[PDB]
Design an enzyme around this catalytic site. Structure first.
Site, short mmCIF file in Angstrom:
data_model
loop_
_atom_site.label_atom_id
_atom_site.label_comp_id
_atom_site.label_asym_id
_atom_site.label_seq_id
_atom_site.Cartn_x
_atom_site.Cartn_y
_atom_site.Cartn_z
N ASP A 132 0.84 -1.21 0.00
CA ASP A 132 0.00 0.00 0.00
C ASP A 132 0.88 1.26 0.00
O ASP A 132 0.60 2.27 0.63
CB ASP A 132 -0.97 -0.05 1.17
N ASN A 137 0.75 7.50 2.34
CA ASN A 137 1.35 6.64 3.39
C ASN A 137 2.90 6.86 3.47
O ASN A 137 3.60 6.17 4.15
CB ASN A 137 1.04 5.18 3.11
#
Ligand SMILES: O=c1[nH]c2ncccc2c2ccccc12
EC number: 2.7.11.1
Length: 265
Positions: A132, A137
């Site tokens: 991810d 992130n």
């Protein structure tokens, strides 16, 4: 370990939102240590049926130790909420940095790729695949160093659809989105996506519809604006291969001439 709880912390300004609860700036009362407190609502986690991702994140992220991986220091919970105690990343996300600058020069890009590649080498050496990696992130420490965060989707490799399903597909390789078995090579494709987005200001398979993004990824259909240089094109085109086995190893990325010439080490 050490049993924390709420009243151990003064909570500050909201740093941001996720699906399942905001992250907050916090300070530990006795030490004055500044950190971030990621709140997740139990109700919403169970309903969504991803509490295992939570366990994984905690187990996986708390044992990793790398300057370009965000530290998780521990966790606690009360009736309605789980709280992850995280290293505070004071310069924010790469997502925000991209929205601020629109796109990055080759030096900032190559440098971020390098930091990502190092962090991923560390992870894949333990067969942990993040899955991810995307600009929301990726956090920035006080010297502006990149830090991979949000290990909720991470898993030990070989793995198969390992959770429910999906949302933004932009950063995911064809194996993942199609629910085939996959391994470390996933993160290589993501690296390729990121390198294009950093240079171009938008990810290469961006579309106005999930279903159209899916098609673009699956056929690996992307093109480069003219300003992108042949070295950048060469790296990206090597990373964004439909067959994972054809994707380079991280070592090969670290030693790519474009990366070598542009990266700040
Ligand atoms: O500046 C930020 N620092 C952070 N540090 C740790 C976790 C999340 C963050 C964070 C999360 C969202 C938006 C900005 C930020």
């Amino acid at each position: 370990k050490r049993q924390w709880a709420l009243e151990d912390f003064e909570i500050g300004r909201p740093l941001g939102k996720g699906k399942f609860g905001n992250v907050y700036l916090a300070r530990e009362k006795q030490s004055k240590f500044i950190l971030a407190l990621k709140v997740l609502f139990k109700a919403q986690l169970e309903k969504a049926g991803v509490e295992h991702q939570l366990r994984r994140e905690v187990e996986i992220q708390s044992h990793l130790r790398h300057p370009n991986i965000l530290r998780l220091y521990g966790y606690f919970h009360d009736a309605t909420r789980v709280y992850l105690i995280l290293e505070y990343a004071p310069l924010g996300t790469v997502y925000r940095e991209l929205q601020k600058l629109s796109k990055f020069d080759e030096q900032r890009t190559a440098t971020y790729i390098t930091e990502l590649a190092n962090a991923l080498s560390y992870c894949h050496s333990k067969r942990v695949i993040h899955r991810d990696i995307k600009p929301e992130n990726l956090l920035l420490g006080s010297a502006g160093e990149l830090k991979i965060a949000d290990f909720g989707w991470s898993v030990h490799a070989p793995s198969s659809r390992r959770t429910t399903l999906c949302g933004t597909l932009d950063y995911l390789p064809p194996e993942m989105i199609e629910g085939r078995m996959h391994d470390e090579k996933v993160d290589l494709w993501s690296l390729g996506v990121l390198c294009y987005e950093f240079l171009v200001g938008k990810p290469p398979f961006e579309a106005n519809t999930y279903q159209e993004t899916y098609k673009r990824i699956s056929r690996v259909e992307f093109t480069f604006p003219d300003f992108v240089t042949e070295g950048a094109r060469d790296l990206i085109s090597r990373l964004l291969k439909h067959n994972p086995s054809q994707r380079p190893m991280l070592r090969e990325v670290l030693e790519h001439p474009w990366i070598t010439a542009n990266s700040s080490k």
